[PDB]
């Protein structure tokens, strides 16, 4: 699918697409226009993704998706540059599975024929412990590889249970380059390579994976007959991002009636705690796990207060939280749910930051609890903002924190609603940004 590369960037991305997998009415198909046949095997599963559903692959022979490149499409051939892109979600590997499977390199996406004795020519995406590997292999047997070594801090890592957007460009005259979320993260020279004769199938499946429990998710798998440049990559990545659905920490759609641990984006090493029922919330340091021998550490998740989002007007609709929804926020404490809000004339700081209260119950005192869940900033981050309203549709502010002291308690970062944030919404970091972290099988603390 050739192009004049002086074209507008959107046009470049659209017409250089040789292959593009989409899921519609639970059927994986090629929407590129070249109509390559896609075969979904029984145990290829579908999970929530970045837009609609995603492919979910588990470790057995029936969990696979195969693309028969339609008759004849060529994108590698001989010295033809190409790019592959996909959203990827890999569970955080436990310390257990690391030191017993660290050395097991297994492919997840590949155009190489797999024989019992050898592999043969093509390209492959593979995982080896906390490494993401891109391999090119020519018909004469020469190989070039990028080995992306993921960072040790798994709260901020790319192969640790969040949806991330992968793009790998191949300039046969220079290098292969690996981008994650539009940022260059690895590279290798590939100049020596000869002809790449790949299979006529692209196979999405865990191949040679010794861990029975391993799985991955993949979405928007896409192939371009060009080596994309950084501007095109940046446009491609942001073309997938939208505010319509709010996101949990993993990148999945936010949901009503679901327990979430709250973490402030600006103080990611902190948890939210409750002083007491009917009183205020504040931040504390979260505990952490460190294993130098295995090259990993992280603040532990699922400590601190659990929150639940409910529809403000039950309205019967699905369970997805959309940006702009009116919600009620509850804390789950001692097997009960307690409303979050601000009492009329309740305690507040001198700057009018309103101190939030949990389960406040004074009879005859109005409790302002109407919130709007919104995405006002930082589209690339899976964070949400919450706007609190009084009884007259006036803004009491975004939920955030205020460093202060109440009574003789220690000095604390106390949860508040503040209108200050609205003059500051383009700032780099703000305390009105929250992660909503649900428990997930892809992250267990060691």
């Amino acid at each position, epitope marked *: 699918c050739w192009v004049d590369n002086e074209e507008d960037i959107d046009v470049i991305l659209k017409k250089s697409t040789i292959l593009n997998l989409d899921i519609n009415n639970d059927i994986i198909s090629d929407i590129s226009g070249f109509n390559s046949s896609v075969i979904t095997y029984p145990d290829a599963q579908l999970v929530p993704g970045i837009n609609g559903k995603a492919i979910h692959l588990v470790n057995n022979e029936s969990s696979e998706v195969i693309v028969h490149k339609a008759m004849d499409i060529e994108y590698n051939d001989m010295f033809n540059n190409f790019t592959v892109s996909f959203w990827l979600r890999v569970p955080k590997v436990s310390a257990s599975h690391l030191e017993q499977y660290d050395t097991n390199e297994y492919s997840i996406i590949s155009s190489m024929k797999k024989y019992s004795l050898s592999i043969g020519s093509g390209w492959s995406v593979s995982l080896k412990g906390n490494n993401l590997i891109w391999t090119l292999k020519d018909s004469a047997g020469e190989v070039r590889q990028i080995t992306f070594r993921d960072l040790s801090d798994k709260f901020n890592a790319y192969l640790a249970n969040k949806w991330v957007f992968i793009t790998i460009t191949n300039d046969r005259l220079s290098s292969a380059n690996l981008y994650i979320n539009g940022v260059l993260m690895g590279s290798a020279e590939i100049t020596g390579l000869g002809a790449i004769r790949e299979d006529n199938n692209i196979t999405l499946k865990l191949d040679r994976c010794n861990n029975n429990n391993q799985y991955v998710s993949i979405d928007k798998f896409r192939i371009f007959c060009k080596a994309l440049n950084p501007k095109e990559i940046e446009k491609l990545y942001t073309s997938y991002l939208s505010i319509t659905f709010l996101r949990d920490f993993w990148g999945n759609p936010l949901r009503y009636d679901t327990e979430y641990y709250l973490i402030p984006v600006a103080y990611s090493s902190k948890d939210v705690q409750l002083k007491n029922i009917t009183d205020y919330m504040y931040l504390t340091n979260a505990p952490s796990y460190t294993n130098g021998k295995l090259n990993i550490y992280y603040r532990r998740l699922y400590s601190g207060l659990k929150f639940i989002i409910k529809r403000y007007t039950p309205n019967n609709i699905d369970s997805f939280v959309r940006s702009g929804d009116f919600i009620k926020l509850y804390v789950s404490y001692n097997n009960n749910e307690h409303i979050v809000g601000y009492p009329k004339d309740g305690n507040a700081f*001198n*700057n*009018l*930051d309103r101190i939030l209260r949990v389960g406040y119950n004074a009879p005859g005192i109005p409790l302002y609890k109407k919130m709007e869940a919104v995405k006002l900033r930082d589209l690339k981050t899976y964070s949400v903002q919450l706007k609190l309203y009084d009884d007259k549709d*006036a*803004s009491l*502010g975004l939920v955030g924190t*205020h*460093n202060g002291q109440i009574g003789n308690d220690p000095n604390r970062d106390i949860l508040i609603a*503040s*209108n*200050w944030y609205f*003059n*500051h919404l*383009k*700032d*780099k*970091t703000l305390t009105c940004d929250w992660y909503f972290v649900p428990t997930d099988e892809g992250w267990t603390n060691d």
Partner: antibody
Framework: QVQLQESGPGLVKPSETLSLRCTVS????????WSWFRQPPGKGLEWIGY???????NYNPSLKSRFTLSVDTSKSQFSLRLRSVTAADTAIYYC????????????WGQGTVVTVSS | DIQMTQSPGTLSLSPGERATLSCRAS???????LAWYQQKPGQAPRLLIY???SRATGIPDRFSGSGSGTDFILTISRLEPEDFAVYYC????????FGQGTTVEIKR
């Protein structure tokens, strides 16, 4: 006992670029928001913009992106740049520290007089 | 874009008298992000009131702020000699803008 001291050229010719600095003493840039204001002779106060150690800035929209604020934490300074100055830019320029989690300013410098003329 | 109109333009009073300064915004400031500054000749402004009614640190108790919506008031309960100056209101709800100032001068 935090003190702010503006410094700049007293006089600037029209169409040049004006550069001003504020030096913080008895304290540091830290995580405060830092603002510039100006007051033309006999004419009252105007907010120009803020700057923050993260590099975040914001401006009075009616000043049409003629100003650029910047900061250097290593020198405990922040600065203002104003392009293509006109006689209407003659004023006293003030630097100030914004109050924590407010957009009011509670610590001010003495101001620096800027005259733009040929 | 919010404009503020202060009245009166000039206030002529004696020490010991009550001073009421008014500020009217072109739109409702539902946040109550309205502040008051004092400026004497040749000096930088001085924050008096913020959040419409909170006194800044170190400000004497004779200064109080009140009001809501579009109408805000600075009161000086009993003028002292050092209080004759210009007073500016500032909204910091949508960007930051000032009124044109009210002068408090000595009546004779």
């Amino acid at each position: 006992q935090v003190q702010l001291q503006e410094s700049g050229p007293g006089l600037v010719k029209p169409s040049e670029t004006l550069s001003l600095r504020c030096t913080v003493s008895g304290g540091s840039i830290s995580s405060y928001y830092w603002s510039w204001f100006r007051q033309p002779p006999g004419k009252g106060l105007e907010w120009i913009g803020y700057v923050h150690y993260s590099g975040s800035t914001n401006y009075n929209p009616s000043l049409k992106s003629r100003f650029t604020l910047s900061v250097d934490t290593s020198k405990s300074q922040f600065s203002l740049r104003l392009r293509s100055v006109t006689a209407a830019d003659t004023a006293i320029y003030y630097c100030a520290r914004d109050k924590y989690q407010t957009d009011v300013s509670d610590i001010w410098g003495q101001g620096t007089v800027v005259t733009v003329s040929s | 874009d919010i404009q503020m109109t202060q009245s009166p333009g000039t206030l002529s009073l004696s020490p010991g008298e009550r001073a009421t300064l008014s500020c009217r915004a072109s739109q409702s400031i539902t946040s109550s992000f309205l502040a008051w500054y004092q400026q004497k000749p040749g000096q930088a402004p001085r924050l008096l009131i913020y959040g419409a009614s909170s006194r800044a640190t170190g400000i004497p108790d004779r200064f109080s702020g009140s009001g809501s919506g579009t109408d805000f008031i600075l009161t000086i309960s009993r003028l002292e000699p050092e209080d004759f100056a210009v007073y500016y209101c500032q909204q910091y709800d949508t960007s930051r803008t000032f009124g044109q100032g009210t002068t408090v001068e000595i009546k004779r």
